Paper text:
In the nucleus of the infected cell, influenza polymerase (FluPol) uses the viral genomic RNA (vRNA) as template to perform synthesis of either capped and polyadenylated viral mRNA (transcription), or unmodified anti-genomic copies (complementary or cRNA), which then serve as the template for vRNA synthesis (replication). ANP32 is required for both vRNA to cRNA and cRNA to vRNA replication. ANP32 comprises a folded, N-terminal leucine-rich repeat (LRR) domain followed by a Glu-, Asp-rich intrinsically disordered region known as the low complexity acidic region (LCAR). First, it stabilises the formation of the replication complex, an asymmetric FluPol dimer comprising a replicase, which is part of a parental RNP and synthesises the genome copy and an encapsidase, a newly synthesised apo-FluPol, which binds the 5’ end of the nascent RNA replicate to nucleate formation of a progeny RNP.
Residue numbers in the entry:
A (entry chain A): 1 to 61, 72 to 716
B (entry chain C): 43 to 139, 226 to 741
C (entry chain B): 1 to 229, 240 to 632, 655 to 668
D (entry chain D): 360 to 390
E (entry chain E): 353 to 386
The structure:
């Protein structure tokens, strides 16, 4: 196809046809028949126009031709030339883009290539166009139909017919005559009519001041609107204004001051799993993958005292919780895990139905009965509580950014680096994983991801019963030892539906060494038992069991599984920082930022305050803080956090403009602040972010004066 | 709506894959070594047989070997893409502010804030000898640059490098072509090279004038003071760059005349920019509005002239903008070029293209230059002609296999070729290594092979690994008989200075990790994907490349337990006594008081007991 | 020491520090604005911004219609839907002046593409409303159901293959006195139960011949349903015409330097840089150039379909009348649209522990005192526009993204005025439908603010409402456009759809290609960095090996297939040529993400392994680039 | 279905196993 | 048979048998039964 097109047509015709076809077809190469038609049409047009010449007064021999070729050029310029000719010569502009313009009679010319016969395609073109432009019809077989006598003569006809004959013969003898398509099929559809309903609907879709659509059409087609915008702006009320104001540092006030109100409750912990208070029971292994039930069984065997504790020492109780139900559920989970069966089904399903609260679900009734029942009313929405800053969020940020002795990240390999960009990426990854491998946040993220993976895996055919899903992880220390860690056990409820959004109840019992009574305001959602004591390095630490009835769904399970993308998010943020640093220079600044070169010292960041004094740290500490921030943003994500993060960006950019001395201006600062502050109700991350923003804004204000 | 989860569940099924019918479909065994590969089920109406993914694995492992002729013909586009990628040359990656063969690499070429220079290749095979020689010389220069006394390292590596089968010295002496790196190596080996001044890619041969470089403090566009040696006096040179040549007449901080011929557009641009930078024009000095702190691979700071050269090669528009313009005369031979190297009378100030052919200055001029310690070539007059700074930074793959028979270049491996070379060298010199070890001498740890090995040990843990290995070897030598396999395994790690903890004892380890982990680790007490040994068959499998160990092994180092050289300071005693407790972690072994006992698990099925000394 | 993350801003520019603040671009699992309450809120808001305009009763459907166009000018800074036709026409006329032949070229190109389009194209969209079942169904299913039901009604246009005959049938079906169709019903039929009664009631999706009247069909055709998995979906009767209207709008948009919606990847940064440089170069000597990062309030709720009908009329002025009529249909059908309000509300008894869902038709069947306060107010405001079938009338406003290209055209037309009253300022900008950046060059910041005020008022005149609570201004050289931060040449992204986790689920041969192509396109278009891309490759390889149980052959992993993979590892000499699905090593990196792994490893494959893998007679075989082999198997 | 709720037959307390009833402290005998 | 205990908010009921009469705290009975 491309071979014949290349051979039988010169390069200019082929490229012009390709350009013409690419304007309306987005898959030019998938249909070469249209290319054949267009290139043949252009060749014919050149044949008509190339050889016929004219002169100044009347000589049909200077350089003036009597034909102007409007085809083969971009439609934007073709339309300009067509309109210019029509206006200059005092003739009407056809609604279609003509192929030629004849200067002897000053008439637009349409030329067609009929496979079947002329005088039939001629009348189809007449129907489509009408009396707007003359027609020249030439057929593959010797035949023609011209609407004028002074038009193309016999000499051009011979060349065009011979050009058609050669292509016809080649197509016949190269098996490509089956690919040919007539021009008619490209014009298919010009007889579009409007019925009686659509026309009437159109009549009542016109703006105010128009009776029917015909009046609107004529008004748009005939009225010159010059001066309308200024006419309407002159008579517009002055109260319609942006009211700009030059922003200053004194205009930037702390956001959400109510978080400093001590008459409010402090935000309680509400994440799915314990992050910094987690305690995992560790059992060395050889790295072989194990079934979750077997891992839990061996971990509980290693700690028999905790496993065999059959009496509850209640330390804390949630207001609406039943400690008996929770303890019996925990004992059922332990017994199920320790049994020799290969199934994680709970033995006491009837009891677990009520222990999890699944039996306390309202009963759907006929809408008619509810309509007659005057006591059935729509429930008021639950307004999120307004809480104040809690120190446990700061403590969580401090602890999760530290380095531990265990790493849960073991990623596969990639091909060797051959390009400098590949080496840049490899060095950046080396530094990132060196700083992030043993971060506590990494292990917490891996635990979350594995728990949600296990939760989703158990939703194939086990959504109608009660299962026990161990909370497990696999970690490795600097010495190469591998440990299986059991952080607790969760019982997964059962939704009779399978809609991907129906709530499934998960009761989680997580080990911890944290006394709930040290920070009472953090744990109102948890009921805590003291299940025993543990020895780690000769020190006895109390082991409590935090029990909580939470809920989720397949969508939330998938989101928690996807929580592993915090690693990629932190990698991208680090790359953005390093690329900003290297934009100032012309070379990569990864080593300079991290280790420091001879010319560049190791980059330092401001990481926090110690008694109101700024504290600096390395890029590794900043990386750990970035990773922890991403993980906490994901874990505590909700509508409030999404809104807060999307809205505080504008304030941050305004502060950046103030720092850069770009003279920022604002139109509604109080509106910005209200939009930001409407999201600070009870999300721990949002409240802590407001506190941190206020502190950093105070520091930026103090630094602006110096 | 969960294809990933659905596929994960399906792969856990028994027979999820549809299997066709025929003789080949009937060549799959019903079950292989207890694994059911194809279902023996006759469907009622569909008659659809099923198989497990294990069936696909079995076919790939033991199935009939079908003909594989003409496969490359069918998938010719993919193989062309692979060939284009493999033959391409990579330039430099620049940060801050199109043929279909480039759109293929768009992911690796263009970033939001970075740009990678990429020269596509393909079927440039004829002159493989010179290309491979150039690549080898460039690699040798790069390796030797970062080492103290670069000249000695370069000469001792160039003598041990072979392209295909001919020694690099022969290639240099015979081909006579090459580039700046080839000339540097030629002079390093004592050969002769053509004499030309080098400024980056610019080759200059003076033909009239004189210069007397003087130290001065100049100001640049970005507003900094730089100490530069400026050249004064009217001088004229014949300049060349790739396929372009010209004549440059310059004076103090000014380019008077720059005649050139028509050539490759990129070559034209490089020649013209390098000519401006060499002219030391103050008009050029004022165009520097970024930061010039470019370094070299050695980590040192480039001299100001090369700083400007690199800056303006990266940012050419910053100079063509601040270079002015003029109108060239309408003479037929004479022309002018705009910022895009086109035909335009609106030409650059002092730059002019010409039709007449300028005779190439590369007349046979084989002389003997003197090379300094830092790879700087100097005439008998004492004027530096070329140096390491002028070597091109382009990187490519050689068309002929080059091998550098020296540990210094082992760093160019994949961290698995490096380990392979290190352990093969250890095995080859095993007898002499052990003989020297059994003398109270520890110089063996300083060998260049261990130098190369240390390049893949995590700098953070290299000292601890070395201390552990040295303690284990000392225990295996002095207080007890040695185990050959453990000695070989732990000898390379002994290089780095010991980093024993405050207690004075080494750090106990279970595995020793290397760069590019996941599978690149050495098990201190068990076989590893990188180092395994058969105690009975005397076979040392390094990366699956089994090598025999007959003779070197000893009769008495077979009955000895492997647990005598697994933890420093601990010696086996008793047996698997299940009273002390479970298999202790390394943390309790480190914390154990001297004279205490402990339990260890060498591998799956070999418990043992040890005692501290 | 107390760690403050925000202190990272003290050492890094905020543009670089907030890079990829959100690791996703899709709707989170919790920020779902779906339900009857949200739809009713949208209706109330849309009618609130147009309640000072004309109000009448539709003569076709009988619904209450509100026309804000050509209404009184706003007297405050609240969202305004009272666009003036004359101002829109003047803006479009100036746009045509600046770009001669652009309207005609776009009209001709769209018309020709329409003449070449086929009915099968109405299957590449998302879920679509189906009037036959009155439910959201995939585009292909809805198209087939409509074609069959039209055949039932003697409407044979889809068989011809062309889209124009199908659209002709679509608009002619609006005139049929009644429409017959095939409806799928869960018929509780008879079954011989095992019980004594022997009647096991059970359902089945049986197809039956249902019939509706002209008015019911017209209301169904103009209806848009609420989504649960854009909060509205349109039927098949509108997609055919919206396709051509959007094609025309895209033809216009791709030729405007201010349009920035089509752009994606490294050319979006190029667009931002070019705009900034162009505006800086044209600043008066000693003048000031400012940039407004702008947001539009109630963009969809304040744009009127009547204004878009006028836009299409003006653009297609010189086109043949048939194409003008074809183009007018989509805005005509959207100016008479009906909103379906969803499932309804839920009323419960706490003492009785009962619950029941009140459907949309029965919203007013109970006293409003039995709804909570907000819902009671919503229903009080909704009553005038409530049809007694569970639907509401939404004549004004654009529901959600349906005419994004045309809205971008209107915005760019607003940006093309450049001046008011021959004052001492000039404005330009970039438009991405509802997001925009404005640049103002003047002599001082005061005249720049005057120009910004004039632009705000002109936008109000055009029906566009700039957000004062979200837009702001600062000296040119730093701004944000479509979540992309620009600062002194450096460029960053606020959000990035990082690769999901798992495999495509086709087969181990195609999954590798799909994942590598995903990473490649992420680092091409979404601005993924080298380290991030390599980490993504590593994560994908981990997921691949976990899903297909194809860990390395030198690893220690137990399994049915791993047992044979280890034997293949032992037998093979060229282990670097084994595929990942065969336990071989992974050799993918940034440079070779576009090459199939079989082609990559061919030169390293063992002769026997490559013969067996590439066996043309293998019993397993029976976008992305892949090579057929034993790994290109099929699943039932 | 309507007659079930109209007559109050649907507003009948549902029996549960004695174990959960014993564990539940809010289940008390009616005066 | 035993005694019937009930929860009104949860609308639950159960029959504590004779053997388990004292299994629950006596404060959960009424005055006469207690
Ligand atoms: Mg034509
Ligand atoms: Mg947008
Ligand atoms: Mg924006």
């Amino acid at each position: 196809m491309d071979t014949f097109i290349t051979r039988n047509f010169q390069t200019t015709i082929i490229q012009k046809a390709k350009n013409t076809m690419a304007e309306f077809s987005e898959d030019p190469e998938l249909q070469p028949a249209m290319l054949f038609n267009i290139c043949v049409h252009l060749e014919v047009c050149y044949v008509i126009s190339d050889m016929n010449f004219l002169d100044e007064e009347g000589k049909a021999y200077n350089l003036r031709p009597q034909y102007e070729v409007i085809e083969g050029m971009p439609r934007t310029i073709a339309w300009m030339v067509q309109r210019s000719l029509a206006q200059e010569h005092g003739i009407e502009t056809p609604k279609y883009l003509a192929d030629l313009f004849d200067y002897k009679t000053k008439r637009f010319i349409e030329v067609g290539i009929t496979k079947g016969l002329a005088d039939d395609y001629f009348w189809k073109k007449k129907e489509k166009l009408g009396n707007s432009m003359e027609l020249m019809i030439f057929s593959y077989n010797q035949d023609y139909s011209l609407s004028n006598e002074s038009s193309l003569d016999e000499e051009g006809k011979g060349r065009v017919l011979s050009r058609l004959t050669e292509l016809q013969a080649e197509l016949s003898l190269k098996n490509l005559w089956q690919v040919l398509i007539g021009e008619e099929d490209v014009e298919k559809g010009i007889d579009f009519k409007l019925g009686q309903t659509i026309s009437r609907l159109r009549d009542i879709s016109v703006p105010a001041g128009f009776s029917n659509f015909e009046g609107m059409r004529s008004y748009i087609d005939n009225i010159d609107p010059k001066g309308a915008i200024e006419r309407n702006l002159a008579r517009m009320s002055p109260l319609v204004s942006v009211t700009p104001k030059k922003l200053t540092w004194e205009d930037l006030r702390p956001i959400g001051p109510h978080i400093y109100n001590h008459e409010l409750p402090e935000v309680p912990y509400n994440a799915f799993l314990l992050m910094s208070d987690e305690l995992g029971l560790a059992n060395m292994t050889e790295g072989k993958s194990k079934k979750p039930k077997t891992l839990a069984k061996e971990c509980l065997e290693k700690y028999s005292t905790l496993r065999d504790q059959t009496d509850p020492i209640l330390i804390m109780k949630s207001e609406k919780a039943n400690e008996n139900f929770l303890w019996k559920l925990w004992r059922d989970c332990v017994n199920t895990i320790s049994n020799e069966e290969m199934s994680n089904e709970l033995q006491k399903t009837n009891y677990a139905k009520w222990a999890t609260g699944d039996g306390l679900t309202y009963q759907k009734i006929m809408k008619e009965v509810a309509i007659d029942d005057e006591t059935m009313c729509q429930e008021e929405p639950k307004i999120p509580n307004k809480c104040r800053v809690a120190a446990w969020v700061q403590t969580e940020m401090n602890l999760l950014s530290t380095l531990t002795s265990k790493r849960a990240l073991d990623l596969p390999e990639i091909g060797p680096d051959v390009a400098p960009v590949e080496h840049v990426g490899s060095e950046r990854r080396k530094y990132f994983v060196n700083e992030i491998n043993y971060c506590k946040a990494s292990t917490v993220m891996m635990k979350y991801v594995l728990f949600h993976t296990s939760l989703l895996n158990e939703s194939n055919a086990s959504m109608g019963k009660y299962k026990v899903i161990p909370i497990t992880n696999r970690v490795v220390n600097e010495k190469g030892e591998s440990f299986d860690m059991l952080y607790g056990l969760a019982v997964k409820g059962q939704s009779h539906l399978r809609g991907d959004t129906d709530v499934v109840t998960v009761v989680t019992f997580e080990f911890s060494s944290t006394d709930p009574r040290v920070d009472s305001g953090k744990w109102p959602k948890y009921t805590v038992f003291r299940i025993g004591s543990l020895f780690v390095s000769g020190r006895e630490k109390s082991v409590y069991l935090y029990c909580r009835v939470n809920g989720t769904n397949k969508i939330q399970m998938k989101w928690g599984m996807e929580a592993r993308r915090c690693l990629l998010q932190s990698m991208q943020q680090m790359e953005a920082i390093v690329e900003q640093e290297s934009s100032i220079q012309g070379y990569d600044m990864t080593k300079a930022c991290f280790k420091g070169d001879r010319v560049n010292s190791p980059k330092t960041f401001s990481i926090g305050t110690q008694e109101g004094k700024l504290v600096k740290g390395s890029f590794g500490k900043a990386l750990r803080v970035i990773f922890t921030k991403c993980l906490m943003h994901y874990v505590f994500g909700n509508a409030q956090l999404e809104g807060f993060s999307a809205e505080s960006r504008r304030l941050l950019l305004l502060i950046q403009a103030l720092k850069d001395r770009k003279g920022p201006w604002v139109f509604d600062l109080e509106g910005m602040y209200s939009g930001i502050e409407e999201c600070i109700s009870n999300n721990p991350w949002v409240i802590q972010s407001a506190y941190w923003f206020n502190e950093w804004l105070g520091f930026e204000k103090e630094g602006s004066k110096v | 709506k969960n294809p990933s989860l659905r596929m994960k569940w399906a792969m856990c099924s028994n027979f999820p894959l549809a299997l066709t019918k025929g003789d080949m479909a009937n060549r799959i065994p019903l079950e292989y070594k207890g694994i059911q590969l194809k279902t023996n089920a006759e469907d009622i109406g569909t008659k659809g047989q099923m198989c497990s993914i294990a069936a696909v694995t079995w076919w790939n492992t033991y199935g009939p070997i079908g003909d594989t002729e003409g496969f490359e013909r069918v998938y010719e586009s993919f193989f062309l893409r692979k060939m284009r990628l493999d033959n391409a040359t990579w330039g430099r990656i620049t940060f801050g502010p199109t043929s279909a063969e480039f759109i293929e690499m768009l992911h690796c070429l263009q970033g939001e804030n970075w740009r990678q220079i990429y020269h596509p290749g393909g079927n440039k095979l004829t002159e493989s000898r010179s290309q491979s020689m150039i690549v080898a010389c460039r690699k040798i220069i790069r390796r030797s640059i970062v080492a103290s006394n670069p000249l000695e390292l370069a000469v001792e590596i160039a003598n041990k490098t072979v392209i295909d089968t001919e020694p690099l010295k022969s290639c240099l002496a015979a081909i006579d072509g090459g580039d700046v790196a080839c000339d540097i190596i030629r002079a390093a080996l004592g050969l002769k090279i053509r004499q030309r001044q080098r400024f980056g890619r610019l080759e200059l041969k003076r033909i009239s004038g004189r210069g007397f470089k003087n130290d001065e403090e100049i100001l640049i566009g970005n507003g900094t003071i730089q100490k530069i040696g400026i050249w004064d006096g009217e001088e004229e040179f014949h300049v060349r760059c790739g396929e372009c040549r010209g004549i440059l007449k310059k004076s103090k901080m000014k380019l008077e005349k720059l005649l050139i011929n028509s050539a490759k557009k990129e070559d034209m641009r490089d020649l013209i920019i390098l000519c401006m930078v060499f002219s030391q024009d103050t008009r050029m000095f004022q165009g520097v509005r970024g930061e010039i702190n470019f370094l070299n691979r050695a980590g040192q700071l480039l001299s100001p002239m090369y700083q400007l050269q690199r800056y303006f090669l990266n940012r050419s528009n910053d100079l063509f903008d601040q270079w002015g313009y003029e109108e060239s005369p309408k003479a037929s031979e004479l022309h002018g070029i705009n910022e895009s190297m086109n035909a335009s009378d609106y030409t650059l100030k002092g730059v002019v293209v010409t039709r007449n052919v300028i005779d190439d200055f590369s007349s046979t001029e084989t002389e003997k230059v003197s090379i300094t310690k830092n790879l700087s070539l100097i005439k008998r007059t004492g004027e530096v002609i070329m140096g390491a700074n002028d070597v091109s930074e382009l990187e490519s793959q050689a068309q002929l296999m080059i091998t550098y028979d020296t540990p210094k270049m082992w760093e160019m491996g994949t961290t698995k070729e490096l380990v392979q070379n290190t352990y093969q060298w250890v095995l080859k010199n095993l007898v002499t290594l052990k003989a020297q070890f059994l003398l109270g001498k520890e110089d063996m740890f300083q060998w260049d092979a261990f130098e190369a090995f240390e390049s893949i040990i995590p700098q953070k843990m290299a000292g601890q690994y070395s201390g552990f290995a040295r303690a284990v070897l000392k225990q295996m030598r002095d207080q007890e008989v040695m185990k050959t396999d453990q000695f070989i395994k732990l000898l390379p790690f002994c290089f780095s200075p010991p980093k024993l903890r405050s207690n004075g004892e080494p750090y106990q380890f279970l595995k020793l990790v290397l760069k590019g982990g996941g599978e690149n680790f050495i098990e201190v007490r068990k076989g590893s994907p990188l180092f395994s040994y058969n105690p009975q068959t005397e076979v040392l499998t390094i990366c699956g490349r089994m090598m025999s160990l007959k003779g070197k092994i000893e009769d008495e180092e077979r009955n000895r337990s492997m647990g005598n050289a697994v933890l420093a300071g601990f010696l086996v005693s008793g047996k698997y006594d299940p009273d002390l407790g479970d298999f202790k972690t390394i943390e309790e072994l480190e914390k154990l008081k001297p004279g205490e006992k402990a339990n260890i698990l060498l591998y799956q099925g070999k418990p043992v007991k040890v005692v501290k000394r | 020491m107390n760690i403050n993350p925000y202190f990272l801003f003290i050492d890094v520019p905020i543009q670089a520090a907030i890079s990829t603040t959100f690791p996703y671009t899709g709707v989170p699992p919790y920020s779902h604005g779906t339900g009857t309450g949200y739809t009713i809120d949208t209706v109330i808001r849309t009618h609130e911004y147009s309640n000072k305009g004309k109000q009448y009763i539709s003569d076709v459907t009988g619904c209450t219609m509100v026309d804000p166009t050509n209404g009184p000018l706003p007297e405050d800074n609240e969202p305004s839907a009272y666009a003036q036709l004359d101002c829109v026409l003047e803006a479009l006329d100036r746009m045509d002046e600046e770009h001669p032949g652009l309207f005609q070229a776009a009209s001709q190109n769209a018309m020709e593409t329409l003449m070449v389009t086929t009915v099968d194209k109405l299957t590449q969209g998302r879920q679509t409303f189906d009037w036959t079942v009155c439910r959201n169904q995939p585009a292909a299913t809805a198209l087939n159901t409509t074609i069959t039901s039209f055949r039932l009604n003697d409407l044979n246009g889809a068989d011809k293959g062309g889209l124009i005959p199908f659209c002709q049938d679509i608009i002619d079906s609006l005139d049929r006195p009644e429409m017959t169709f095939f409806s799928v019903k869960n018929i509780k039929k008879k079954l011989p139960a095992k019980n004594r009664k022997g009647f096991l009631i059970k359902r089945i999706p049986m197809k039956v011949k249902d019939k509706i009247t002209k008015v019911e069909y017209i209301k169904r055709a103009l209806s848009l349903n609420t989504m649960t998995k854009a909060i509205a979906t349109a039927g098949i009767q509108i997609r055919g015409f919206v396709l051509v209207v959007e094609n025309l709008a895209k033809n216009i948009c791709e030729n405007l330097e201010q349009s920035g919606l089509p752009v994606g990847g490294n050319e979006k940064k190029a667009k931002l840089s070019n705009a900034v440089a162009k505006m800086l170069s044209n600043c008066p000597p000693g003048g000031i150039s400012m940039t407004v990062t702008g947001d539009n309030t109630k963009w969809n709720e304040c744009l009127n379909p009547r204004i878009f009908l006028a836009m299409t009329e003006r653009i297609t002025r010189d086109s043949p009348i048939w194409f003008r009529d074809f183009c007018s249909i989509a805005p005509v059908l959207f100016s008479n649209k009906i909103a379906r309000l969803g499932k309804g509300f839920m009323i419960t008894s706490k003492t009785k522990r009962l619950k029941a869902q009140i459907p949309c038709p029965d919203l007013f069947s109970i006293p409003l005192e039995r709804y909570n306060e907000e819902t009671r107010a919503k229903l009080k405001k909704l009553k005038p526009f409530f049809n007694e079938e569970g639907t509401a009338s939404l004549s004004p406003g654009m529901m959600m993204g349906m005419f994004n290209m045309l809205s971008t055209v209107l915005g760019v037309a607003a940006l093309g005025i450049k001046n008011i009253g021959n004052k001492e300022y000039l404005w330009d900008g970039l438009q991405s439908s509802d997001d925009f950046a404005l640049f103002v060059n003047a002599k001082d910041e005061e005249t720049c603010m005057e120009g910004i005020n004039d632009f705000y008022r002109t936008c109000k005149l055009l029906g566009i409402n700039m957000s004062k609570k979200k837009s702001y201004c600062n000296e040119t050289g730093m701004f944000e456009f479509t979540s992309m931060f620009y600062r002194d040449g450096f460029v960053s992204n606020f959000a990035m759809e990082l690769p999901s986790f798992g495999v495509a689920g086709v087969n181990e041969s195609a999954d590798m290609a799909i994942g590598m192509t995903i990473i490649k396109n992420n680092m091409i278009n979404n601005g993924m960095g080298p380290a991030t891309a390599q980490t993504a490759i590593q994560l994908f390889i981990a997921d691949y090996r976990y899903t297909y149980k194809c860990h390395r052959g030198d690893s220690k992993v137990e399994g049915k297939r791993m047992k044979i993979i280890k034997e293949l590892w032992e037998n093979t000499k060229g282990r670097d040529g084994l595929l990942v699905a065969d336990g071989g090593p992974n050799i993918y990196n940034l440079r070779n993400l576009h090459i199939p792994e079989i082609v990559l490893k061919y030169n390293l494959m063992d002769p026997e392994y490559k013969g067996r893998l590439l066996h043309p007679q293998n019993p397993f075989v029976g976008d992305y680039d892949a090579v057929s082999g034993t790994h290109s198997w099929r699943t039932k």
